Amino acid sequence: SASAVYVLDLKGKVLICRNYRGDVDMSEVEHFMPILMEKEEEGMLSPILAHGGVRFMWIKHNNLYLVATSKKNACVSLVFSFLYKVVQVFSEYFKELEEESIRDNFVIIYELLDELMDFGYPQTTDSKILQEYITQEAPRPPATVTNAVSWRSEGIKYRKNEVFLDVIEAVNLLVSANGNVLRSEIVGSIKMRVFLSGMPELRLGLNDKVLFDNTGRGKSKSVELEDVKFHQCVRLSRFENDRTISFIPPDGEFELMSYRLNTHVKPLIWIESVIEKHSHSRIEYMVKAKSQFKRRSTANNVEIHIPVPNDADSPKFKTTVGSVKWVPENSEIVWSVKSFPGGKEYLMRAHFGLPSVEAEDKEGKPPISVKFEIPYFTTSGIQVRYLKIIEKSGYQALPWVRYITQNGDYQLRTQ
Amino acid sequence: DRKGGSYSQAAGSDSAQS
Amino acid sequence: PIRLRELIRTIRTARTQAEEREMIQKECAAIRSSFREEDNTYRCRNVAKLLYMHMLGYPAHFGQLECLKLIASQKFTDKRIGYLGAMLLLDERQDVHLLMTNCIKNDLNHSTQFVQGLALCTLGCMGSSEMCRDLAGEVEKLLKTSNSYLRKKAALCAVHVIRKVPELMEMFLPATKNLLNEKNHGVLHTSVVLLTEM
Amino acid sequence: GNIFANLFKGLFGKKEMRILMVGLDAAGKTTILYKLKLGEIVTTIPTIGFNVETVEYKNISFTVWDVGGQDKIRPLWRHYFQNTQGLIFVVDSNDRERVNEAREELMRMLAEDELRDAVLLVFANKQDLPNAMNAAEITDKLGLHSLRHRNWYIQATCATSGDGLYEGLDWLSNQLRNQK
Amino acid sequence: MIHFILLFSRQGKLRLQKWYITLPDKERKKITREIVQIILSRGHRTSSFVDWKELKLVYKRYASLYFCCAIENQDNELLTLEIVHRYVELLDKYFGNVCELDIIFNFEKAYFILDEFIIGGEIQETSKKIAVKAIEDSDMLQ
Amino acid sequence: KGENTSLLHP
Amino acid sequence: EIFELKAELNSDKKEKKKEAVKKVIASMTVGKDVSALFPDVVNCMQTDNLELKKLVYLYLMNYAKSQPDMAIMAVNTFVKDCEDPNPLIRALAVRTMGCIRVDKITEYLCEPLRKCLKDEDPYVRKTAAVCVAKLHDINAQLVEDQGFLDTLKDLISDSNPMVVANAVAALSEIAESHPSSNLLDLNPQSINKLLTALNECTEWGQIFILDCLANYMPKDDREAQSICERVTPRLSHANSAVVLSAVKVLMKFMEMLSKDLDYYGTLLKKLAPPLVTLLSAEPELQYVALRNINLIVQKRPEILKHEMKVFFVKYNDPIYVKLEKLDIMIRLASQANIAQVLAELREYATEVDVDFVRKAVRAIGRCAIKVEQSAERCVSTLLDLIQTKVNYVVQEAIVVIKDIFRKYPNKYESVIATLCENLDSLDEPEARAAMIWIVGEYAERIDNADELLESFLEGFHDKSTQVQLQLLTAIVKLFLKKPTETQELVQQVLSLATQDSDNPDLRDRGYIYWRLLSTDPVAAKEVVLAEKPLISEETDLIEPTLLDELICYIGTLASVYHKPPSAFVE
Numbered sequence A: 001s002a003s004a005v006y007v008l009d010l011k012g013k014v015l016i017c018r019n020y021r022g023d024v025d026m027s028e029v030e031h032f033m034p035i036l037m038e039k040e041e042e043g044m045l046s047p048i049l050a051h052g053g054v055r056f057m058w059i060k061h062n063n064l065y066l067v068a069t070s071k072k073n074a075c076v077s078l079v080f081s082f083l084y085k086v087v088q089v090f091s092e093y094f095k096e097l098e099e100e101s102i103r104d105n106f107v108i109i110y111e112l113l114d115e116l117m118d119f120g121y122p123q124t125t126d127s128k129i130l131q132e133y134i135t136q137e138a139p140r141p142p143a144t145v146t147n148a149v150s151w152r153s154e155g156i157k158y159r160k161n162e163v164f165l166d167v168i169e170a171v172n173l174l175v176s177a178n179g180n181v182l183r184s185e186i187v188g189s190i191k192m193r194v195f196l197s198g199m200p201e202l203r204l205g206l207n208d209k210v211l212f213d214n215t216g217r218g219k220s221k222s223v224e225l226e227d228v229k230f231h232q233c234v235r236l237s238r239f240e241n242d243r244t245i246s247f248i249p250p251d252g253e254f255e256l257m258s259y260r261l262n263t264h265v266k267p268l269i270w271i272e273s274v275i276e277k278h279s280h281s282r283i284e285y286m287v288k289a290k291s292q293f294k295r296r297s298t299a300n301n302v303e304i305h306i307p308v309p310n311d312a313d314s315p316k317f318k319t320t321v322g323s324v325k326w327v328p329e330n331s332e333i334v335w336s337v338k339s340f341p342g343g344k345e346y347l348m349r350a351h352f353g354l355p356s357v358e359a360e361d362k363e364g365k366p367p368i369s370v371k372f373e374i375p376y377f378t379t380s381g382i383q384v385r386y387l388k389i390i391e392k393s394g395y396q397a398l399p400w401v402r403y404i405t406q407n408g409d410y411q412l413r414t415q
Numbered sequence B: 001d002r003k004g005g006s007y008s009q010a011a012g013s014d015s016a017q018s
Numbered sequence C: 001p002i003r004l005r006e007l008i009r010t011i012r013t014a015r016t017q018a019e020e021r022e023m024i025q026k027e028c029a030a031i032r033s034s035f036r037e038e039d040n041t042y043r044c045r046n047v048a049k050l051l052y053m054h055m056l057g058y059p060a061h062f063g064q065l066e067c068l069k070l071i072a073s074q075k076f077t078d079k080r081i082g083y084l085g086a087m088l089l090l091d092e093r094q095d096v097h098l099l100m101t102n103c104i105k106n107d108l109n110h111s112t113q114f115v116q117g118l119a120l121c122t123l124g125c126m127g128s129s130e131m132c133r134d135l136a137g138e139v140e141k142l143l144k145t146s147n148s149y150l151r152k153k154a155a156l157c158a159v160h161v162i163r164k165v166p167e168l169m170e171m172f173l174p175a176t177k178n179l180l181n182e183k184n185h186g187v188l189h190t191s192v193v194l195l196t197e198m
Numbered sequence D: 001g002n003i004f005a006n007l008f009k010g011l012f013g014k015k016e017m018r019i020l021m022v023g024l025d026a027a028g029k030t031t032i033l034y035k036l037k038l039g040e041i042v043t044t045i046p047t048i049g050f051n052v053e054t055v056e057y058k059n060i061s062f063t064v065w066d067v068g069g070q071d072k073i074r075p076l077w078r079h080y081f082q083n084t085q086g087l088i089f090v091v092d093s094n095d096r097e098r099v100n101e102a103r104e105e106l107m108r109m110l111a112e113d114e115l116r117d118a119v120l121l122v123f124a125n126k127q128d129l130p131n132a133m134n135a136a137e138i139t140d141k142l143g144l145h146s147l148r149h150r151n152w153y154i155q156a157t158c159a160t161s162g163d164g165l166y167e168g169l170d171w172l173s174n175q176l177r178n179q180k
Numbered sequence E: 001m002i003h004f005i006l007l008f009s010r011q012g013k014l015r016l017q018k019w020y021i022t023l024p025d026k027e028r029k030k031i032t033r034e035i036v037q038i039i040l041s042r043g044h045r046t047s048s049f050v051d052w053k054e055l056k057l058v059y060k061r062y063a064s065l066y067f068c069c070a071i072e073n074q075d076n077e078l079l080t081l082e083i084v085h086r087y088v089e090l091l092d093k094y095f096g097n098v099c100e101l102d103i104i105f106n107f108e109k110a111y112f113i114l115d116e117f118i119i120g121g122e123i124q125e126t127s128k129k130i131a132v133k134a135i136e137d138s139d140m141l142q
Numbered sequence F: 001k002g003e004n005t006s007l008l009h010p
Numbered sequence G: 001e002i003f004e005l006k007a008e009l010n011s012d013k014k015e016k017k018k019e020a021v022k023k024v025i026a027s028m029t030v031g032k033d034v035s036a037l038f039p040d041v042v043n044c045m046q047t048d049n050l051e052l053k054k055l056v057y058l059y060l061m062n063y064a065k066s067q068p069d070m071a072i073m074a075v076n077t078f079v080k081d082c083e084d085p086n087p088l089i090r091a092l093a094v095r096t097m098g099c100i101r102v103d104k105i106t107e108y109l110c111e112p113l114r115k116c117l118k119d120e121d122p123y124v125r126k127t128a129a130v131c132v133a134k135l136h137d138i139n140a141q142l143v144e145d146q147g148f149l150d151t152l153k154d155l156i157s158d159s160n161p162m163v164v165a166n167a168v169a170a171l172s173e174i175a176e177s178h179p180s181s182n183l184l185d186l187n188p189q190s191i192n193k194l195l196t197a198l199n200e201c202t203e204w205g206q207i208f209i210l211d212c213l214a215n216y217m218p219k220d221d222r223e224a225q226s227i228c229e230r231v232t233p234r235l236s237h238a239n240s241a242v243v244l245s246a247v248k249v250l251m252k253f254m255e256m257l258s259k260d261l262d263y264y265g266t267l268l269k270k271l272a273p274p275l276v277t278l279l280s281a282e283p284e285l286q287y288v289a290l291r292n293i294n295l296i297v298q299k300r301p302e303i304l305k306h307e308m309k310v311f312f313v314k315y316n317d318p319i320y321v322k323l324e325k326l327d328i329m330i331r332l333a334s335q336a337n338i339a340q341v342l343a344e345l346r347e348y349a350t351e352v353d354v355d356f357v358r359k360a361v362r363a364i365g366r367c368a369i370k371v372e373q374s375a376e377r378c379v380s381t382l383l384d385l386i387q388t389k390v391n392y393v394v395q396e397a398i399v400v401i402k403d404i405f406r407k408y409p410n411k412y413e414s415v416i417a418t419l420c421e422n423l424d425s426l427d428e429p430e431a432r433a434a435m436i437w438i439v440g441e442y443a444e445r446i447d448n449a450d451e452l453l454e455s456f457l458e459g460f461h462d463k464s465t466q467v468q469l470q471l472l473t474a475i476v477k478l479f480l481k482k483p484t485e486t487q488e489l490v491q492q493v494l495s496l497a498t499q500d501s502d503n504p505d506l507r508d509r510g511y512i513y514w515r516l517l518s519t520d521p522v523a524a525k526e527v528v529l530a531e532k533p534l535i536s537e538e539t540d541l542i543e544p545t546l547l548d549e550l551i552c553y554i555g556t557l558a559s560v561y562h563k564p565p566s567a568f569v570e
Ligand SMILES: Nc1nc2c(ncn2[C@@H]2O[C@H](COP(=O)(O)OP(=O)(O)OP(=O)(O)O)[C@@H](O)[C@H]2O)c(=O)[nH]1
Pocket: D024, D025, D026, D027, D028, D029, D030, D031, D032, D042, D043, D044, D045, D046, D047, D048, D067, D068, D069, D070, D126, D127, D128, D158, D159, D160, D161
C-alpha cells in the first residue's frame, strides 16, 4: 500500500515522483536524505525509513534510490515486489538505469508509472505485454491483460520455432578458515529464450528424484531439488498434483524455474593458500589451486580473487599458469586463468612489500572468491528429459538448451 | 560455437514411460 | 609521475564515493610503488598527490618516512613539500616526529632565509613537548638577531614553545628585553604577542 | 627487448650502491662520515635526527645514512630497513659499560627477517686510545663468527687520522660487486 | 590564537584545513564533519559566530565556499573577521582574481601563503604587501 | 557552476 | 517564459500545444511551481491526440489540491471522455477522476463511476474497482450513499479474474478502514470461487486473492484441510511476496488444524523449503524475510529446527541482514549445532563493524545463557577473545562474563584467575561495573582482590553512580568475607561514600552499609553475603496474545518492527 512512488538521485534530487493516494505530503521527501545520512553514519541505516508517521521503504538502484512513501501498515513485501517489477520494466525498456534516461524519457516514464499501479495496487507488470500499449515512439489494450494468459501475447508468428534453454549452474561455497566448507548450496536456474509461433503449451520433463520415485525409477541419477520455484507461466496445480510441469512459455528470454538444493560433494576447486606475513616487513602467498572437477571439463575464465594487503606495494608474482594481476581499486590479487583443465593444479607464490609504519585502523579479512565458469558441466547431475511443445495449429518445434556451470557464492574464508 | 557449452537439442517427453 | 593538476582533474571526474575511492587508490598504488623504489626526481608530485588524498579523507600513514627523507634533502621544492607534509600529516601523537628534530636543527642554521623560515614555521605549527626541550637553545639564537623577516618567526616559535613548555619562559626573559623599538609593524606585533603570552 | 644502452653505460660504470651508518651515540660516526665525504674532522652536536649523504668513489655512489644511538632513537632503525642494501656497524670500544648494550642492539637489529641481503660491516672507531682492543678481541666478544648467512668484516679506522677507511671501502665494494 | 582554519565548500567539500591543535585524526575528522553540519545548517543572519565546545567558531563566507576559524574565548571576535578578510585579499592579490577552481588545484600555494601569514594560530605579518613580496621571493627562488 | 566567481570581486 | 508558454498553449496549432504540454510537464518535474497556469492549460484539454491528454490529466491531478477552485472546469470533460469507445481513454479518465482530491468534484463523479462499474471492458472494470476505493477513501459516506458496496461484492462473482482481484483488493481496502460494521465476509462458496481464480490471477492479483483469506476464520478441519490443499501450491511461485503471503495464510489456517492428523506434518515439511528459498532473495527482501522467520520462529519452532547452515551470514551481506542473522541463529541455537554456532560467532568477532562485534558478543552471551551444555565452550571462547586484546571485544566480553557468572557461577571459579590480570585500565562504564561485581561476588579465588580494588578507589567519587554503587557493594562483600586484609578498606569506603558522597541512592546505600557494619557484623554474612535465588532470564519470546495477532499481520510494517499495527500508525 505505497503512497507515492518517487525516483531519487545521488545528490538528493527527486528525478521523478508519482503519487498514488495523496495521503502523504509531497514535501516529506526532503527529510529522506538527511534521515538516510543520519542512519548511515550511525550504523542504523535501513532500506525502510520512518519520517514520523510516514515510512520510506526503498531499494538502491545503480544511480537512484527508488523510494516509495507510505503511511498505513502497508505490505512492505508488496512494495518491494513493485519496486523490483518497476526496475525490471525500466531495464527492459531502457538498456541502462542511470540519470541519463530519467531526464530524457519522461514522456513514457509517466505513462508507465500511471499504468503500472493505481491507488497503490499494481495491476500490470509484464514488460512484453506492457510494450503493446505504452510506447515512446495508442491503440486499445491487448486482450492478454484481460485474458488469463498475461505472459504470452496471442498471434505471435515466427518463420522458425526455436526455443533456446540455459541450464545455468550456481556453485556457492562457504569454506571456513579451518579448512571445512560450511555453506555449499547449488542453485539451479533454467532460463529459456522462447521463439515460437502461436501460444504453445510447453510440457517440460526432467530427471527429478520425486518423479523417478513416483514412476518407480528411483534408482538412476536423479536430481534431488530441495526447492523448485517455477515462473508465473508454470501451473502450480499441475506440478503439485503429479509433478507435471506444464506452462505456456513467453516470447523472449525469461526464468522458467529456479532449482535450489544442497550438495554434499567435494568442491570442484580446492584452494590451498598460505600467508607468510612478516610484521611490517613482507608477506608470502603460498596459494595452491586444486581442480577437483572432472578432467573432461574446462573452466573458462578462472578468476580466483586473493585479497592482498590494502597497503601492499611493489608486488611480485611467482605463479605456474595464468596471468596474475594486482588491482589496487579492489585491493586483491586477481588470479586470472583463461582455461583450467579438470584435475589441473596451479601453484603461485606471491611476495609484496609493506610500509614500516603500522596502520591506524584494522582492515579486516575479505574472503577469497573464485570466478570459475565451466561450460557443459552439470554438477547436480540433472538432465532435461523432454519438452512437450503442443500447438493447436500443429508444428514441429526444435528445442535447444545448454548447460553452463559457474561459481555463485564461491567464497573462502581467510585465516 | 558459444561460451558456456554448446546448446543441445531436447526431447519431447519421457518416451520410456509412455 | 602524474602532476597534481591532472590528479585533481581526474578526481573531479569521480561521481560516486565508491568509484572515487577506487580512483584514489589507483593513484595511491602508483605512489606507493614509486616511494618503495626510493624515487628522488618526481617525489614532489607524489608528495602533493598523497597530501591531496589524505585531505580527501584517505589514509596516508605510509607516506610518513618519505616526508622525513624529503625534509633532509637539498632541493627547494622537495624541502617545501616535506615541510608541508610534516605540518599536515605530522603531529605530536604521530610518534614519527622525533627524527625530525635533527632535520630542523640542521635547517635552523641554513644560510637561506626561506628554508630556515619553513623550518621555524613547521616547528611552531607542530611543536611537541619534547622537540621544544632540545630546540629552545637554537630558538633564542634566532630571536636576538636583526633579521626583520626572521624576528617575527622567532617570536612566534618562542611563544609556541612557551605554550608547549611553560617552564622554559625563564630563558626568554633576557632575549626580549629592549625590543619595543622595532620600526616594522610585524616585529612589534610579534613582540607584543610574546609579551602578552609571558 | 634491447639493453644496449645498459651495456654502454656499464662501459664507464653504472652501479652506484648504497650504505648504512648506525651505532651508539658518541661513537665517532658523524666525524667518520664527514671525513669520508669531505676529509676533515668536523665538530657536530649529538645527532637528534640522522645524516644522509653520498660518496663518489670507485665509480660507485656510496650513499651513507648516519643513524644515532639515542635511546628514543634506538627503535627507529626499522625506518631505514626498507629498500636498504648495505649495513655498517660502528662499535665503541672505549665504553666498557656500553659495549654490552651495543652488542645487544646489534643482535636485536640482526634478528630481523627483512634485512638478510645486507652484509655485516664492522668499523673499529676511536682507534686513538691505548685502551682500544685489537681487531679480534672485539669480534670474539661480540661473536661475529656466530652470524649465520652474514658476511662480516672488521676494520679499524682512526677517526683523527683516517687510516683503514680505504681498505674498508675496497672490501665493501668487493662484497657488493662480484665482477672484475 | 586560532585553533584551526577550514576552507569548506557550500556542498560540504573542504578545500583547505589548518589546525593548530594536536588532535587525533578520527577526532579531527569528526570535528570537521560536525563543523560542516553546524555551519551548513545555519541561516544567513546567524551573526557569523558560533560557540562550539567553548570555542567561538566564526564563519564568514565570501563565495559558495565558506571559511571558518576557532578562536579561544580570550580575544576579540571582529579581529578574526578582519584577519579572514586580509587573508582573502592577500590570496586574491597573489594569484589574481582568485576563484574556486584555483583553490582546489593551487592548494599548495594557499598552504604556503597561510604558513607565511599565520603561524601557530597567531598572526605573522600585519601588513598586506610585505607578505606578498616575501611569498614572491620564496616562489622565485625555484 | 558558482565556482569560477571571484572571492571578493576586487 | 511564462507568457510565451501561455501564448504557445493558447494557439491553434497542435505542433505547439504538444511541445507546450511537454515543457509544462518537464518544468514541474524539474521542480518548478507551475500551478499558476492551471486555468491556462484547461482550455487545451479536450484533444483528439492521446499523448497530450495524459499529460493534461497528470497536471490536473498534481495541480488539484493547490487550486481546487479552478478545478471545477473539468467535470464536463471527464463526463464526455467516460463514454469513448476506446477502453484506454475511459480507463485513463476513470483513473484521473479518482485521483483529483477535490471535495466539490467527487460528488458529481458518481454517475460515471456507476456507468463504468458494469462495463464489459475488463480494463474499465479493473480501473473502476480502484476508482471506487479511491472515492470511498475521500468520502466514505458518499460511497455508501451511491450504493457501491453491492456492486463491488458482485464483482468477485464475475469472470475476468484480474478484475476480480482488483475488486477484492478494493473491498479489502474499504473494509480495513471500516469499523467492522457490515463486514464483507463470505461463506465457503465465495472462498472456493476465489480459489478457483487464484490459479488464474496475475503476479499482483495473487496477493490480493490471498489477503482476503487472512481475515476469514475456518471452523472445521475439513475446510481448513481443503484450503491448505490449494494454499500449498503457492509455495512454488517466483514472486517472493506471493510465497510470503502463502506462508502467512498457511500459518493462520494452522491455528484450526489438528496435529493428530498427517496434514500438520506435511504442512510443516513443505514450508521449510519455502523459507529457505526466501533466504536467497534480494538483499532488500532479506530484512523482511528475517523478520518473518523471527515472527514465525516463536510460534512453531519445529519447522526450521534443522535449518542452521543457511542462517550463516555472508561476507557481502548488508548490515541490516548481518544484524538479523545473529538473532536468527540465537533463536535457532540448540545443543545439536552448538559447535557450529560457536565457530560462526568466533569468526564474527574478527570483523570491523563495532556494532556487528557488539551484536556478536550479545548473541554469544545469549547462546551461552540459553544452553547450559555449552557453557564451558562459551567461557573458553570469551577468554580467548579477551586474550586477543580488543578494546570493544574486551568490553563486550566483560559484560558477557558478568552475565554468565550470575547465571551459572557454581563452576566458574577456574576463570577468575585469568580475569584477575586482564588490562583493567578499560574505562567503559558497562565493563568496569561488571568487573567490579565479578571481583566482589567471586572474591574467594582471587588472593589479591583487596589490591586490585585500590586502583578503582582513587576516583570513586567522580567515576559514576552505577560504578560507585558496584564498588561499594564489592568492598562490603570483601570486608564481610575477609575482614582481616580489608579492615581499613571498609572504613575508607564508608568515609568516602558517606562524607564526600553526594549521591542520594549512593549515600543511602553507604549509610545502610555503615549501620549494618556497626550493628552486627556477624549477621552481615547472612544478610549481605547470602545465596540469591535463581535469576529469571529475560524471555525473548513475545506474548502469546500479540503473536496470535502478529501471525495475521504477515509481510506488513507490523511484522518488521514486531510492534502492534495500532502502536505504529498515525
Ligand atoms: N679524541 C678523539 N675523539 C673522537 C674520535 N672519534 C670520535 N671521537 C669522539 O666521538 C664523538 C662522536 O662524534 P660524532 O661522530 O660527530 O657523533 P656520533 O659518533 O654520530 O654520535 P651521535 O651523534 O650521538 O650519534 C665526538 O664528540 C668525539 O669526541 C677521535 O678520533 N679522537
